[PDB]
Design a protein around this ligand. Structure first.
Ligand SMILES: c1ccc(CN2CCC(n3cccc3)CC2)cc1
Ligand code: NI
Length: 341
């Protein structure tokens, strides 16, 4: 059964609600982004309208085989009417195609669903500017002050510099990057660019990247592994056993692997600054875990909410324990008292 924090009161709409069968009274199903916990249940057999971004629609058609007659892509930053209700899609700064959804209800109430997002000051100059919001459905993944991590730019600078130094010292080194979904493409694209290489990958992963409207993509990626010195592998293979195995398949073209494992937050962010990060090493293989987040830090989330000044907040993550729920509610009250709304 579909939970309350996925229902839009006063409409026939749901958000990211595909795993509950036919939802009673739902005439339009919105999808914020193409991550499996959110799309769970969608397939070629789905026969109701799905509203989403153009990139999300390309992935629905090509990867899940959803029939084209049921895919309703909407442009960003544009007032659209769906089933008699004005809606707007905004960039979420999450993975490719990810959106936040603004709903202008018939009764005059205004609701923002963030989906998954990494809050940024640039969102203060979207169509949200000077817009009253009555209800905010908030991605609270990292809603506690312990959750700190660097900017995406700082993490990419570290990765580029690390890879360039390694391959300049040893021209026979291979660089490997782990992946398990869409998102975090900048990690492998930035490394390949500094090295003058295309990124090599499986046919399945190539198909996924061909759906993302990335400019000049044919110049950047390939299924010919042997022409490339930056390879993508599934995240589960980025360990000493899996990398040793991969090194054998390249036919003595390479004599060293440098691998990156993009993670979210980890506890080492408490103690170790990104510049000070060191790898796990065994012989000619080194593995770097790098904290490349596509969710708001605590500080980023607090800034966004204090600027927006919503009347009510409904968390959508960490809602399953009394302790977690209470912790988030205490921070929302602090933020409101500090800012005066
Ligand atoms: C929102 C609100 C509360 C939680 C629970 N965690 C908070 C942070 C804790 N922590 C301590 C040291 C490193 C993390 C672990 C419990 C999650 C999300
Ligand atoms: Ni996500």
């Amino acid at each position: 059964t579909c939970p309350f924090y996925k229902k839009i009161p006063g409409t026939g709409f749901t958000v990211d609600a595909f795993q509950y069968g036919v939802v009673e009274g739902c005439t339009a199903y919105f999808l914020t982004h193409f991550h499996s916990d959110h799309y769970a249940g969608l397939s070629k057999h789905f026969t109701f309208p799905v509203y989403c971004s153009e990139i999300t629609g390309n992935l629905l058609k090509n990867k899940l085989h959803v029939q084209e007659q049921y895919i309703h892509p909407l442009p960003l930053d544009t007032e659209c009417i769906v089933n008699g209700v004005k809606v707007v899609l905004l960039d979420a700064n999450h993975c490719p195609g990810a959106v936040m959804i603004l709903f202008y209800l018939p009764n005059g109430t205004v609701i923002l669903h963030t989906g998954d997002f990494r809050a940024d000051p640039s969102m203060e100059r979207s169509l949200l500017a000077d817009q009253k919001v009555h209800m905010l459905y908030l991605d609270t993944t990292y809603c506690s002050p312990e959750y700190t991590f660097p900017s995406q730019q700082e993490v990419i600078r570290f990765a580029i510099n690390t890879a360039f130094e390694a391959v300049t010292l040893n021209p026979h080194a291979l660089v490997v990057c782990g992946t398990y979904s869409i998102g975090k493409e900048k990690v492998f694209l930035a490394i390949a660019d500094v090295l003058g290489s295309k990124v090599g990958m499986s046919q399945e992963k190539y198909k996924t990247l061909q759906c993302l409207n990335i400019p000049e993509i044919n110049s950047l990626i390939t299924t010919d592994m042997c022409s490339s010195l930056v390879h993508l592998l599934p995240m589960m293979q980025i360990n000493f056993k899996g990398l040793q195995s991969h090194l054998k398949k390249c036919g003595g073209k390479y004599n060293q692997i440098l691998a990156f494992r993009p993670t979210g937050w980890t506890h080492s962010n408490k103690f170790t600054r990104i510049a000070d990060v060191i790898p796990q090493t065994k012989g000619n293989i080194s593995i770097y875990g790098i904290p490349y987040s596509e969710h708001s830090s605590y500080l980023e989330m607090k800034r966004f909410v204090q600027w927006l000044k919503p009347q009510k907040i409904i968390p959508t993550v960490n809602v399953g324990t009394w302790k977690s729920r209470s912790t988030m509610e205490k921070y929302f009250r602090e933020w409101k008292l500090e800012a005066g709304y």
